[PDB]
């Protein structure tokens, strides 16, 4: 039971930390190679490069290949960010983090091959469906909770949670993507980053911050998942900041009482008082009334039936140009 | 027939111009007064002020009341824009322009009372439904065509057409709203304005422009109505401009042939060559193949059945503060 759960997580998190430190320090370099994947179709694009749907010639598995054009990355000054994501990503291992299956580079480009998640991002389902019900939202919250719990024990702080980076999988579960802001930080950090509407009052107030930033982000999420829109927004970030800074939310009436209370303990301006920050940390979140019905090990195990499960002219193809090129810069990749 | 139509419009446009010049020059000042309307509920808000759903105590009619707070307008430097819209609006009169039923001011505020259009804006139906069919889109285009034809003969150039300012009425027809960019200009103008994605290559290239800007805007519209998204877009206006400037559109395959051709004559970078600008003007648009099936007088008469017809916690009320105040500035209102 309970104690017995605690028992378990403890043990787990500990073994987990051992594997992470190992990788963290003794990495992973040139896993596969281009030629070993067949090119199926452009899934999307963007600065940095285009993201392709590929299938691994032997294995017949499908992956999503992110192709970063070295030169572009360098120009947009995203070297450090690119190398740190590769690093974090090949070190970590958790049911709800998308997986970095293979990595490689060539004259021209950097390649990151993750596990293909067809359902897409929550963001779009969210705006289309409108609102998620307290229970649908709770399923997703449960998953994030755990992830944060894990992530944090590795001194990592995800710094950009928002529906846009949570993709829905074949079984209805979440997968956290894109770690280009994560930081391993045993302490306080100061850089200013993330998305406006999710930013913690501390980040903008320029005081240095820590793990607690992601627990205030959690609060915006459940709020936007259950409301339909975020607790603070305005067209013009400045404006937004202002509001986040007063820390004055208006919960919709259909909220629960129980959900308001949790929200109010997450949407805390005072770190001292924020749930997630107190001596007990997670525990304060997992023991909340709002989560009473939640089987956490059950969720860690994908054992719970999920409530939702996702199921135009196409692109204008092109050609991995591959033609050393920025070689000093990306040596660590 | 045809000739006979031509006959008519001629006559019409002429009489129309006579009424417009009259008002243009001999206006309309303090029509109603606050007390004569009961306050039903906030429909929306914003800088400048909030927009209310009111009902005219005697008459029992519903209006939408725009309340502009003099001080705010002055601070955001929108005096000239506010007075010119009031002016244009009380001068004009056309089946598809929302109506300025009453106007007034008081110590505190400026009041513009238009006809209430419950269906909302096309923008939202558009993004929800997704795409409009060549025929649904054609119905809307037909209406805009006419409006532009009218508007222009009064030397007015609307300078901001986009799905967001076209509201759908009770019978499925369009109503053009918000004229805070319109200009009466017998000639070329130079100010830089409108929405990025609808901007004419000339506006951004800073060469002075004229009526033709609204015919290039028409082209973006039918394009976004039929495609789902605009012919030029990018996250970051700069980017957008660039593309508009090359004037290189990609029509989706489901387009018609006939619709491509019209589009290509509207999405013309060369004014010399743009449909709407040539000797014949409108005529080049109304005689296009894409519109062959269109009964224009029929449409002017709302005689055609429309294809679509439109049919959360509420606001946090407040209080017309009314408490002279900016009196020099808004004298002309």
């Amino acid at each position: 039971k309970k104690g017995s759960e605690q028992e378990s997580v403890k043990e787990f998190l500990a073994k987990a930390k051992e594997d992470f430190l190992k990788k963290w320090e003794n990495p992973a370099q040139n896993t596969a190679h281009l030629d070993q994947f067949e090119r199926i179709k452009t899934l999307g694009t963007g600065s940095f490069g285009r993201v392709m749907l590929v299938k691994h010639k032997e294995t017949g598995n499908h992956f999503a290949m992110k192709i970063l054009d070295k030169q572009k990355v360098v120009k947009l000054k995203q070297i450090e960010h690119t190398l740190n994501e590769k690093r974090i990503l090949q070190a970590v291992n958790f049911p709800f983090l998308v997986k970095l299956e293979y990595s490689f580079k060539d004259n021209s480009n950097l390649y990151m091959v993750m596990e293909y998640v067809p359902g897409g991002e929550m963001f779009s389902h969210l705006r289309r469906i409108g609102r998620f019900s307290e229970p649908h939202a709770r399923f997703y919250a449960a998953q994030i909770v755990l992830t944060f719990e894990y992530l944090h024990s590795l001194d990592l702080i995800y710094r950009d949670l928002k529906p846009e980076n949570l993709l829905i999988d074949q079984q209805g579960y979440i997968q956290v993507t894109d770690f280009g802001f994560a930081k391993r930080v045993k302490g306080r950090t100061w850089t200013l980053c993330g998305t406006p509407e999710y930013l913690a009052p501390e980040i903008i107030l320029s005081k240095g911050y820590n793990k607690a930033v992601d627990w205030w982000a959690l609060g915006v999420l459940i709020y936007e998942m259950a409301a339909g829109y975020p607790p603070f927004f305005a067209d013009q970030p400045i404006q937004i900041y202002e509001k986040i800074v007063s820390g004055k939310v208006r919960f919709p009436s259909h909220f629960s009482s129980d959900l308001k209370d949790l929200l109010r303990n997450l949407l805390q301006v005072d770190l001292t008082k924020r749930f997630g920050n107190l001596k007990n940390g997670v525990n304060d979140i997992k023991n909340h009334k709002w989560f009473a019905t939640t089987d956490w090990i059950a969720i860690y195990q994908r054992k719970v039936e999920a409530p939702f499960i996702p199921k135009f002219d196409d692109y204008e193809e092109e050609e991995i140009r591959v033609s050393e090129k920025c070689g000093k810069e990306f040596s660590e990749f | 027939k045809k000739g006979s139509e031509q006959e008519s419009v001629k006559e019409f446009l002429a009489k129309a111009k006579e009424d417009f010049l009259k008002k243009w020059e001999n206006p309309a000042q303090n029509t109603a007064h606050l007390d004569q309307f009961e306050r039903i509920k906030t429909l929306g808000t914003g800088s400048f002020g909030r927009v209310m759903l009111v009902k005219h105590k005697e008459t029992g009619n519903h209006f939408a009341m725009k309340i502009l707070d003099k001080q705010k307008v002055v601070k955001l430097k929108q005096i000239e824009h506010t007075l010119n819209e009031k002016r244009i609006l009380q001068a004009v009169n056309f089946p598809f322009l929302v109506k300025l039923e009453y106007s007034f001011k008081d110590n505190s505020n400026l009041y513009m009372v238009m006809e209430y259009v419950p269906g909302g804006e096309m923008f939202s139906h558009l993004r929800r439904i997704g795409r409009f069919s060549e025929p649904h889109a054609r119905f809307y285009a037909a209406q805009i065509v006419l409006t532009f034809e009218y508007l222009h003969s009064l030397d007015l150039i609307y300078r901001d057409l986009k799905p967001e300012n076209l509201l759908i009425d009770q019978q499925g027809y369009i109503q053009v709203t918000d004229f805070g960019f319109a200009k009466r200009v017998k000639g070329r103008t130079w100010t830089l304005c409108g929405t990025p994605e609808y901007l004419a290559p000339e506006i951004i290239l800073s060469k002075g422009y004229n009526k033709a800007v609204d015919w290039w805007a028409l082209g973006v519209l039918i394009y976004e109505m039929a495609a789902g998204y605009p012919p030029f877009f990018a996250d970051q206006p700069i980017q957008i401009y660039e593309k508009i400037v090359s004037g290189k559109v990609r029509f989706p395959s489901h387009f018609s042939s006939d619709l491509k051709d019209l589009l290509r004559n509207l999405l013309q970078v060369d004014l010399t060559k743009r449909f709407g600008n040539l000797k014949n003007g409108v005529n080049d648009i109304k005689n296009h193949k894409w519109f062959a099936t269109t009964d224009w007088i029929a449409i002017y008469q709302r005689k055609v059945e429309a294809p679509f017809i439109p049919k959360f916690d509420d606001y946090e009320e407040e209080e017309i503060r009314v408490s002279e105040k900016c009196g020099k500035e808004f004298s002309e209102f």
Partner: peptide, 18 residues
Amino acid sequence: TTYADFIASGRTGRRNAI
């Protein structure tokens, strides 16, 4: 704050980072 005001802002699409 409210649905009507949020679906009127420009912020209903994917938001970027800073």
